[PDB]
Design a protein around this nucleic acid. Structure first.
Ligand SMILES: [K+]
Ligand SMILES: [Mg+2]
Ligand SMILES: [Mg+2]
Ligand SMILES: [Mg+2]
Ligand SMILES: [Mg+2]
Ligand SMILES: [Mg+2]
Ligand SMILES: [Mg+2]
Ligand SMILES: [Mg+2]
Ligand SMILES: [Mg+2]
Ligand SMILES: [Mg+2]
Ligand SMILES: [Mg+2]
Ligand SMILES: [Mg+2]
Ligand SMILES: [Mg+2]
Ligand SMILES: [Mg+2]
Ligand SMILES: [Mg+2]
Ligand SMILES: [Mg+2]
Ligand SMILES: [Mg+2]
Ligand SMILES: [Mg+2]
Ligand SMILES: [Mg+2]
Ligand SMILES: [Mg+2]
Ligand SMILES: [Mg+2]
Ligand SMILES: [Mg+2]
Lengths: 119, 88, 101, 73
RNA sequence: GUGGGAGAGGGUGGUGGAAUUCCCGGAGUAGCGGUGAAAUGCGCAGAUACCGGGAGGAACGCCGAUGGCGAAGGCAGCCACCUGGUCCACCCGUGACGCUGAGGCGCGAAAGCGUGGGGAGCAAACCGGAUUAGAUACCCGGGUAGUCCACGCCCUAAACGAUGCGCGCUAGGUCUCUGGGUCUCCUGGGGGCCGAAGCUAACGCGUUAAGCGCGCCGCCUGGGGAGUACGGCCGCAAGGC
């Protein structure tokens, strides 16, 4: 019970996992998948294959709500965000745009030691 | 700050003759003007140290020009000191 | 006395009595802070490059004035007391510097 | 790349001190809101650092973007 | 003196957007996180990902430089106010008024101390998870002082160019910031690189001397014992000289 048919597809991709959340043109999630959603457990989650499976499973569950075309937004840089893009490229969804929304601060907060040499 | 009209007033006050700008008298005048300004601004802004150094410097220049003047013309140094109330 | 430009941006959704009221009150603020008004450019409703008070547009008033320095900030703060006023930027005037000419 | 065509070549005579003028200014920042490097603007150190300050004024006035999103990708 | 100048020099007040954290609301479901791999952790009292609203602290992306300013420490959103130093042009005024500088006084990163606030992120100590033969560590999840503000102490440092301050003299080339010009180029004033003569144990330095001179101050006299001991001074203490 949705009948959405056009929407937004967000790919949040880190070094440790991927999450595709697919939502409506308002931005409310229709569905979401991820690395752990598909079987994977450990580090194997930040693997572009896993990222494919996730974006794909997402697009599946999405056409179940009867979605056809989508606009991709990409947050994050890390292994196989591009492979998630490629999953959605032809997942059976026509992709209207692709954007890069990866946030960056104007140096508000002090990063953890892992991330130092910056502010 | 200090407007050119003001500064002019003090020069055309303290000149030895019409036309004098840089004589000792005029300088110690101007120096004193500027000093009194700066210590007014340092009454508030007790935290502004970088300007305060500049005032130490100003002060030292003043006292030197005075040391000179008093080595040359003691009566004219009495004059200056009476006018600006300095040294006491 | 010094030369400043007062940048005021208001709400675009105002009706006329409301607009004339605001400009009336900005006039009064200038008068009562001692600022002579040399020039006005009113551009008006124009698209902002990002939302301001979750508003997609903005209403543009420009003044060029000359006022005593000791009072400037007060005047600026006065102009922000109003509800319908979104930004107030007050800058000292400086003659043009034009590259490639 | 980045040495392809330089901004100040195209534009005619213009005030670099004007924060109120969008159309001139918008030229000087990238696809994102980012103010462009010297090689791309081709201005003198002085010019550049003046454009900075007037751009940042324009930004606070709500006229120019602080940042944008990257299309294509 | 007059006329111009550049600048994150300092102080006070105000404002801006990005980002994190938390809270409220909508939608949505089984994981999110994290590593070499994991586990602790958080999550069906609904997280993670996503959209909208609010709160609050802290820091200022691009410009940003090999750049600039400052005596040094050090200084970076934007605006106004207060304010210090400096550079050039004119060659107008004074007429050696100069240099250095033991004591003294003042400034003086960070950590630290006191009283009162503030407290988002980070984070000694600590609490846990791993790894290892052990692991009081490196890695992971937490977290207090603290980092922030006001006032007052403390006075150290690889507080470094490891190069005291001032003036004169001794090839050039090259890049650059900022003035003035008869604007190719010349000429002041800063920042760099290469190198004449010279210096240097060498490395190197070389009109931004570590060259050639003069003035004045600080300091050195084998290593360890030792910045220890005794004494004095300063400090609330820690401790410093
Ligand atoms: K030393
Ligand atoms: Mg993983
Ligand atoms: Mg400054
Ligand atoms: Mg559990
Ligand atoms: Mg349940
Ligand atoms: Mg709070
Ligand atoms: Mg940079
Ligand atoms: Mg330093
Ligand atoms: Mg100044
Ligand atoms: Mg003369
Ligand atoms: Mg004579
Ligand atoms: Mg200290
Ligand atoms: Mg401290
Ligand atoms: Mg404290
Ligand atoms: Mg930790
Ligand atoms: Mg060093
Ligand atoms: Mg050179
Ligand atoms: Mg030079
Ligand atoms: Mg030789
Ligand atoms: Mg050399
Ligand atoms: Mg011995
Ligand atoms: Mg010691």
């Amino acid at each position: 019970k949705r009948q959405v048919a056009s929407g937004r597809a967000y790919i949040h991709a880190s070094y440790n996992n991927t999450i595709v959340t697919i939502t409506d043109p308002d931005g409310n999630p229709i569905t979401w998948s991820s690395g752990g959603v598909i079987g994977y457990k450990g580090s194997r989650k930040g693997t572009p294959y896993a990222a494919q499976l996730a974006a794909l499973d997402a697009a599946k569950k999405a056409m179940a709500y009867g979605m056809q075309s989508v606009d991709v937004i990409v947050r994050g840089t890390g292994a196989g965000r591009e492979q998630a893009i490629r999953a959605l490229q032809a997942s059976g969804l026509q992709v209207k745009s692709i954007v890069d929304d990866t946030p960056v601060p104007h140096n508000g907060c002090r990063p953890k030691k892992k991330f130092r040499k910056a502010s | 700050p200090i407007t050119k009209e003001e500064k002019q007033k003090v020069i055309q006050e303290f000149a030895r003759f019409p036309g004098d700008t840089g004589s000792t008298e005029v300088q110690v005048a101007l120096l004193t003007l500027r000093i009194n300004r700066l210590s007014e601004h340092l009454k508030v802004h007790k935290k502004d140290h970088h300007s305060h150094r500049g005032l130490l410097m100003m002060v030292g220049q003043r006292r030197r020009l005075l040391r000179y003047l008093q080595r040359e013309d003691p009566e004219r140094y009495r004059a200056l000191i009476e006018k600006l109330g300095i040294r006491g | 006395m010094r030369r400043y430009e007062v940048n005021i941006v208001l709400n675009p959704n105002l009706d006329q009595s409301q607009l004339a009221l605001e400009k009336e009150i900005i006039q009064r603020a200038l008068e009562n802070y001692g600022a002579r008004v040399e020039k006005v450019e009113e551009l008006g409703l124009r698209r902002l490059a990002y939302p301001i008070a979750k508003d997609p547009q903005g209403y543009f008033l420009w003044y060029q004035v000359e006022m005593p320095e000791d009072r400037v900030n007060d005047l600026a703060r006065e102009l922000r007391i109003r509800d319908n006023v979104r930004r107030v930027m007050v800058v000292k005037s400086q003659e043009p510097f034009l590259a490639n000419a | 790349p980045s040495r392809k065509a330089k901004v100040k070549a195209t534009l005619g005579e213009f005030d670099l001190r004007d924060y109120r003028n969008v159309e001139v200014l918008k030229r000087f920042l990238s696809e994102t809101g980012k103010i462009l490097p010297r090689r791309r603007t081709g201005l003198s150190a002085k010019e550049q650092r003046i454009l900075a300050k007037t751009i940042k004024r324009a930004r606070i006035l709500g006229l120019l973007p602080f940042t944008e999103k990257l299309v294509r990708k």
